[PDB]
């Protein structure tokens, strides 16, 4: 079962990292998934694992791996967990209550902030209802917070999205953070994605 190495170093270590409301999704399969490629980044703000243990991870083998990446604030990172409420949790990215995987977040103030302000990262603010688990909604229609039918941006009509203003002089809890979520599962399969072993 000699194979090549997985592209972990590519989902991490990227220039553009995608906004939260349009989070990326990469499938990992048919390779050797060495987990020593990470830990080479900054001291993580959070390394919570749910289905397995971080140490009991090198020797284990999976079926398929999904990686999701986006950028959020500092005080919103606590909302990425099974069964949590808040703006980001129910309007941008919702996790199932039986999640089996790990969540990695590390500060990236030195790469995602500018003196004049960075307006290339957005996040949805208004929506009609909640979000189903592992769902995405990328659309732009004027919100109707009123009785009169909405036509355009004006009174009681709002543009759904909004951008951050990341600056290097912001305090902790407002600086950008890079978040990567891995979702493993063990089921009926030839166990394609196995850890490095001989």
């Amino acid at each position: 079962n000699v194979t090549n190495l997985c592209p972990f170093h590519e989902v991490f270590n990227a220039t553009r990292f995608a906004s939260v409301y349009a989070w990326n999704r990469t499938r990992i399969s048919n390779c050797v998934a060495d987990y020593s490629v990470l830990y080479n980044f900054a001291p993580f703000f959070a390394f919570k694992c749910y289905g397995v243990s971080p140490t009991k991870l090198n020797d284990l083998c999976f079926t398929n791996v999904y990686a999701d990446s986006f950028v959020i604030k500092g005080n919103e990172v606590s909302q990425i967990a099974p069964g949590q409420t808040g703006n980001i949790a129910d309007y941008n990215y919702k996790l199932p209550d039986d999640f089996t995987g790990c969540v990695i977040a590390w500060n990236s103030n030195k790469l995602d902030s500018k003196h004049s302000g960075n307006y290339d990262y957005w996040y949805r603010l208004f929506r009609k209802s909640k979000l189903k688990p592992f769902e995405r909604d990328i659309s732009t229609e004027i919100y109707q917070a009123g009785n009169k039918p909405c036509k355009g941006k004006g009174p009681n009509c709002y543009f759904p999205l909004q951008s951050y203003g990341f600056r290097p002089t912001y305090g902790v809890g407002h600086q950008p953070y890079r978040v990567v979520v891995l979702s493993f599962e063990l089921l009926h399969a030839p166990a394609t994605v196995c850890g490095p072993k001989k």
Binding site: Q162, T169, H174
Partner: protein, 596 residues
């Protein structure tokens, strides 16, 4: 959807835009104040214009949702703040006239100067030379000349501008709902909609009258003592039963009596507790002072400064070509950014000032979780009192002994305590009548009781009747003495000091009672105590989400202002003064005048 949901959505959008706009404006202002040039002024002006315009349009949109269909009692406060603090009612021509008048008055006050009559080519500004001359010089003629020259060269110009200004302000205030501008100022203390905590705009006047009536005797005893000492000083101008002439109070106006300590010390032989020499010997600096203040604040349970505070704030004057303003201020730029700007030397006064500014920064840090429109003190007096209590607690001999600046071979007899209490009194008690009289005069002027031809007459009559101070030179209606003050000429309220003076002492007595301390109140420290810190934080974190009466009841247990703590603070000094004044007459008569 009902009104409340739309109001909540609008509030969310407004907060999320106003945070960024306010941050940009504050950053521009700081960049100007640290690196004074011209392009910084341009950027600051642009940011201010953007912020003002945005507030104007947001108020115009916010004027749509009615206030009588909302029962949440927290949306209502923010909506009222938007509707009241950004609305423009007067026509464009009147607004331009008012702005031009304000700018002209500010420029006249700032650029005003006087020249020596002997040498017209020689001129000196107010702040560098006039303040120093009024402070340290001891000679009747020069002080009288400086006082008269400044009054005649400022008030005469500023009188017509004030006369035109009062009418426009009265029209603007009467436009919305208020009777006049005095009601507009007094509306800050109003509380509505809460049962058992209501406060009307007319209650403040009665409360101030009651507190001053309860304060008067101590002030008159101190006045008699100071008059006797000044008689011992000046032998041909002061009268035994007269009043103190205005040009012998240690400063330009008489707001503070601090500069009379070197002349009226109860016991000259006993030295003070100045610790400048020890700080010089131990090789200290600004960093050490600020670290000590941080440690003191940590010792009571409050959190300490962030890394951005040490990274961004400047604590020493760069000098050289980097011009800057050395007035100590505490900045709150938002988005978790806090800085302090000051030029720190090695002096005990700088120690106390650093403690005061760190207290202000802690107050700003405490409530940084409420909505954008509620991140402010309960009223205009809480913030100053919270700042001042730290300086009160950080000057005790016990704290200095624990720190190490004061030698352990120091003893506290009668005379040291008497001197300390007198020095505190000369600055605290000596300013209350001045503030009360000034605010009362402005209130009558705005209300219209005093006509335009009796301004100076009523001003000096009330000065004699309340402050017990008589002018050295008669003034006709061509003079405008109140305009010579910065606050009066720059459109600022003045009762906040009167409120903070009582608030700080109530807070200090409550905190010392919570720490289980015995002995005189003037010797109290809360450095190690953690109950006091938590109790203070419980009020600090509130912000503006509750009426100030509720916070006051939570802290001290009293709904209204009380003067008992202030009297209890000065009790030994009061007894000593009562024992000392058994010979000289107590009181004053207004019939006397220095000019025959």
């Amino acid at each position: 959807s009902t009104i409340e949901e739309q109001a909540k959505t609008f509030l969310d959008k407004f907060n999320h835009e106003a945070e960024d706009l306010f941050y940009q404006s504050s950053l521009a202002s700081w960049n100007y104040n640290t690196n004074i040039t011209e392009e910084n002024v341009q950027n600051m002006n642009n940011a201010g214009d953007k912020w003002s315009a945005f507030l104007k349009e947001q108020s115009t949109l916010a004027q749509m949702y009615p206030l009588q269909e909302i029962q949440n009692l927290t949306v209502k406060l923010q909506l009222q703040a938007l509707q009241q603090n950004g609305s423009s009612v007067l026509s464009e021509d009147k607004s331009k006239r008012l702005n031009t008048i304000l700018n002209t008055m500010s420029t006249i006050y700032s650029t005003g100067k006087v020249c020596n009559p002997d040498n017209p080519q020689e001129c000196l500004l107010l702040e560098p030379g006039l303040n120093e001359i009024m402070a340290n010089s001891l000679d009747y003629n020069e002080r009288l000349w400086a006082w008269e020259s400044w009054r005649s060269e400022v008030g005469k110009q500023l009188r017509p501008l004030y006369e035109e200004y009062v009418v426009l302000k009265n029209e603007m205030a009467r436009a919305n709902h208020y009777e006049d501008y005095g009601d507009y100022w007094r509306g800050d203390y109003e509380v509505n909609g809460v049962d058992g905590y209501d406060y009307s705009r007319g209650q403040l006047i009665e409360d101030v009258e009651h507190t001053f009536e309860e304060i008067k005797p101590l002030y008159e005893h101190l006045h008699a003592y100071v008059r006797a000492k000044l008689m011992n000083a000046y032998p041909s101008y002061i009268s035994p039963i007269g009043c103190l002439p205005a040009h012998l109070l240690g400063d330009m106006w008489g707001r503070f009596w601090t500069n009379l300590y070197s002349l009226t010390v109860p016991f000259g032989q006993k030295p003070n507790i100045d610790v400048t020499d020890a700080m010089v010997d131990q090789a200290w600096d600004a960093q050490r002072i600020f670290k000590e203040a941080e440690k003191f604040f940590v010792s009571v349970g409050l959190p300490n400064m962030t890394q951005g505070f040490w990274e961004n704030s400047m604590l020493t004057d760069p000098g050289n070509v980097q011009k800057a303003v050395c007035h100590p201020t505490a900045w709150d730029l938002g988005k978790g950014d806090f800085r302090i700007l000051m030029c720190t030397k090695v002096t005990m006064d700088d120690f106390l000032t650093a403690h005061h500014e760190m207290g202000h920064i802690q107050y700003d840090m405490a409530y940084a979780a409420q909505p954008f429109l509620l991140r402010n003190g309960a009223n205009e007096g809480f913030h100053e009192a919270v700042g001042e209590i730290m300086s009160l607690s950080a000057a005790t001999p016990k704290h200095l002994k624990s720190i190490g600046l004061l030698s352990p071979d120091f003893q506290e007899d009668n005379e040291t305590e008497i001197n300390f209490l007198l020095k505190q009194a000369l600055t605290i008690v000596g300013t209350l009548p001045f503030t009360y009289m000034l605010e009362k005069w402005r209130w009558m002027v705005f209300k219209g009781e005093i006509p335009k031809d009796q301004w100076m007459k009523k001003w000096w009559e009330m000065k004699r009747e309340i402050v017990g101070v008589v002018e050295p030179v008669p003034h006709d209606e061509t003079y405008c003495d109140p305009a010579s003050l910065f606050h009066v000429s720059n459109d600022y309220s003045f009762i906040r000091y009167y409120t903070r003076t009582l608030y700080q002492f109530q807070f200090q007595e409550a905190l010392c009672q919570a720490a289980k301390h015995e002995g005189p109140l003037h010797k109290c420290d809360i450095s190690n105590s953690t109950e006091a810190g938590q109790k203070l934080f419980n009020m600090l974190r509130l912000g503006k989400s509750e009426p100030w009466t509720l916070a006051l009841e939570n802290v001290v247990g009293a709904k209204n202002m009380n003067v008992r703590p202030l009297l209890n603070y000065f009790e030994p000094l009061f007894t000593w003064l009562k024992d000392q004044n058994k010979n000289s007459f107590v009181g004053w008569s207004t019939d006397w005048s220095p000019y025959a």
